[PDB]
């Protein structure tokens, strides 16, 4: 039975590959030959948000586009007022080892998680004027890689146990569990309509899930190494990825195959984070080599470099407004680039 | 009033400096080791689903934060990025054990990891009394698993602890030599392995860790001051 089932699975793999290849008439490079290249994109460090003790591992912009939460391995969440560099909050964490942080779209909560296998929800707007833990979402058997708020009550989280889970914060129990990734899930990205989310794992494959149904819609396997970053294209029909193999790949949900790969021969180090600009034309990627490269999404060539970090650029994020880009680094400073 | 907001930010920065002092004054240690190794007993004997079990203990008025990784997947590639820039790694091995080759491969992976390249390893060879009993009894011999012990002879520098048979000293020094060889193969001077012959009940473990942290911090400062 095992051999027969494997043969059937390989036949299905071949069918999927053939269909994807047939759908490949042109490539995004050919279509984007016409469009004039973005040219030289230059952005300067408008702010430096210092005050963290240890490596900054994650950051997330608030929907208001001014406040941004930031996590460091010293057990500190700091909500910065990006405009004035003010520390709005400094939430001490019960677990020093934090690998992810999220900001609720309403701005009322920040989620947090890491090597404690727990995603802690913090209530920013209590009546006591002190940020307190609103919930602790236990149930993962590995570290929390990424977490994102669907709303004030729903949060979906990756894990190093190779599963993604959707939670109901009031109840504190997993509404549904997404299984199928063969390696540690390293990042999420919620679609702008929040009906779909895509997760990259250490098995070098990116999967698309349906939150309401709870099942993998389709799978993408372009990369040769583990995926460290993933972000949805603003249109919601494509998403970029970042892998240790030092290349981004842009997939389209409807073509169900890679559209383009962003890589250069000198670029020989892994990617830690990726995101698009407001229009989706620029694909900002952070790298292990202490700097961040700006790519022309439609084309395949660098449009600039956000050099200026003294250590690994661990996290990167673009305001929902699209006005500025915040990049955190293992040297413990966030920098806002505009 | 944004002036009051700036005052609040000032207060937060004051608290952050207060905590920065504690963070600087404390040393962080990553505890590793296979389940058969008595790392759990090592943390238990410290007299001061979940993924980490922090242990606080203090020696000569210096605080040590020892982190033991708990519920985590069998592959340690990714989460060991966090423990980059810790004071040291305490890799514990069962000397008696035979999964000693698994321990050797694990130690090789830890040593040659990209991010742990500047992290010294306080290599613990635990359960040495059990190794002594194993060798003396003759039920099992390391020659069955490793062929070089049929050729190895005790080096001169091997100081015999009183009451130790020559056979057990030779065995334990062969075990030590395995790990020292793995460490010296890639040791470029950025990180140093610190082998130790230890037992589960030994209260000397905290003192040994403190001494090796003293040496590691001494090397770090020496490199910082351009003396190495």
């Amino acid at each position: 039975e095992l051999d027969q089932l494997r043969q059937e699975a390989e036949q299905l793999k071949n069918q999927i590959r053939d269909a994807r290849k047939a759908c490949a008439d042109a490539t995004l490079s050919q279509i984007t030959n016409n469009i004039d290249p973005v040219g030289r994109i230059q952005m300067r460090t408008r702010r430096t948000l210092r005050g963290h003790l240890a490596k900054i591992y994650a950051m997330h912009w608030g929907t208001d586009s001014r406040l941004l939460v930031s996590a460091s391995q010293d057990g500190k969440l700091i909500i910065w007022d990006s405009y004035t560099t003010n520390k709005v909050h400094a939430i001490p964490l019960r677990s020093s080892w934090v690998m992810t942080c999220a900001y609720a779209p309403s701005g009322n909560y920040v989620a947090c998680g890491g090597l404690d296998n727990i995603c802690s929800i913090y209530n920013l707007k209590t009546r006591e004027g002190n940020v307190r833990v609103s919930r602790e979402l236990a149930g993962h058997t590995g570290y929390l890689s990424c977490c994102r708020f669907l709303d004030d009550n729903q949060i979906v989280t990756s894990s190093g146990d190779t599963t993604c889970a959707l939670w109901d914060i009031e109840t504190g129990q997993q509404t549904t569990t997404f299984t199928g990734h063969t390696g540690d899930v390293m990042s999420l990205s919620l679609a702008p309509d929040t009906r779909l989310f895509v997760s990259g794992a250490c098995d070098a494959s990116a999967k698309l899930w349906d939150v309401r149904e709870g099942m993998c819609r389709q799978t993408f396997t372009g990369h040769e190494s583990d995926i460290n970053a993933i972000c949805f294209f603003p249109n919601g029909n494509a998403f970029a990825t970042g892998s240790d193999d030092a290349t981004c790949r842009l997939f389209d949900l409807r073509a169900d195959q890679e559209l383009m790969t962003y890589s250069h021969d000198n670029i020989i180090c892994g990617i830690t984070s990726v995101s698009f600009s407001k229009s989706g034309r620029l694909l900002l990627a952070g790298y292990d080599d202490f700097n961040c490269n700006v790519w022309d999404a439609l084309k395949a060539d660098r449009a600039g470099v956000l050099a200026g970090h003294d250590n690994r650029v661990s996290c990167l994020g673009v305001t929902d407004d699209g006005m500025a880009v915040a990049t955190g680094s293992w040297d413990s400073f966030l920098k806002i680039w505009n | 009033e944004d002036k009051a907001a700036v005052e609040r930010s000032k207060m937060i920065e004051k608290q952050l400096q207060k905590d920065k002092q504690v963070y600087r004054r404390t040393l962080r240690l990553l505890l590793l080791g296979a389940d058969n190794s008595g790392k759990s007993t090592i943390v238990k004997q410290m007299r001061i689903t979940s993924g980490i079990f922090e242990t606080k203990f203090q020696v000569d008025k210096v605080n040590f934060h020892m982190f033991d990784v708990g519920a985590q997947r069998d592959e340690r590639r990714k989460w060991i990025q966090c423990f980059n820039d810790v004071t040291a790694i305490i890799f514990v091995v069962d000397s008696s054990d035979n999964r000693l080759q698994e321990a050797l491969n694990d130690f090789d992976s830890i040593w040659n990891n990209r991010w742990l390249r500047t992290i010294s390893v306080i290599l613990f060879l635990n359960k040495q009394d059990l190794l002594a009993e194993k060798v003396l009894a003759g039920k099992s011999k390391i020659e069955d698993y490793f062929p070089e012990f049929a050729r190895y002879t005790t080096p001169e520098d091997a100081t015999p602890e009183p009451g130790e048979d020559p056979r057990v000293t030779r065995a334990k020094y062969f075990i030590r030599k395995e790990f020292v060889d793995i460490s010296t193969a890639s040791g470029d001077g950025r990180h140093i392995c610190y082998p130790h012959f230890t037992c589960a009940v030994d209260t000397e473990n905290a003192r040994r860790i403190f001494n090796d942290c003293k040496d590691i911090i001494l090397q770090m400062n020496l490199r910082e001051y351009n003396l190495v």
Partner: single-chain antibody
Amino acid sequence: VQLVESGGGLVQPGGSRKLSCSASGFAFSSFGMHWVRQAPEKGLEWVAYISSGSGTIYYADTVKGRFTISRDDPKNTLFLQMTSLRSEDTAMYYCVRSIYYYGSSPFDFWGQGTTLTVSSDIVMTQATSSVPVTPGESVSISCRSSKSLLHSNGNTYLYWFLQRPGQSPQLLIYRMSNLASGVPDRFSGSGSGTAFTLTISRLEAEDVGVYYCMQHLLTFGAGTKLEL
């Protein structure tokens, strides 16, 4: 969240007193406290302020030097010592809680207060002293300011307070547009940067009371009463 004032009573004009307010149910340290006096048959008047961490302190010109504000975090108590008094100082002394950071709501909670008795400014003017009205109707309570309350940063620092008879004031609208937590959507805030309007849409039996405007660019308005 509970702030109960202490002291109060009869004092001769040359005498001295000390009002104490004990905070309960919130992190008293993080909040900057105010003292606001409510003289009989007259509107609110801001007395003094002490920021978080016993830092910046301000007093009104009338009581600058005469009064002194003090704060004790361990006891969660706010003090207001008056070395000298007058007949004017007779007033219900409220202790007001406020916190300042981006998006916060200053002056959200008001203590019950104690009635002490005794033997340039941005003047706020309210268009009407009293507004006879019927239940279920909308009312456009309006006020003006000496200078535009719209700061360079981009928000008008205007606050609206409702004082139900026999109650302490309650924050309705802060920064001219944002409803306070627990305030029903009946109320609405609007303004031009120099003139402002609190346009309640449907009156309720609990919405009848005296409405005070305040600026925070501290001065309160004369107060507009609602008569059902």
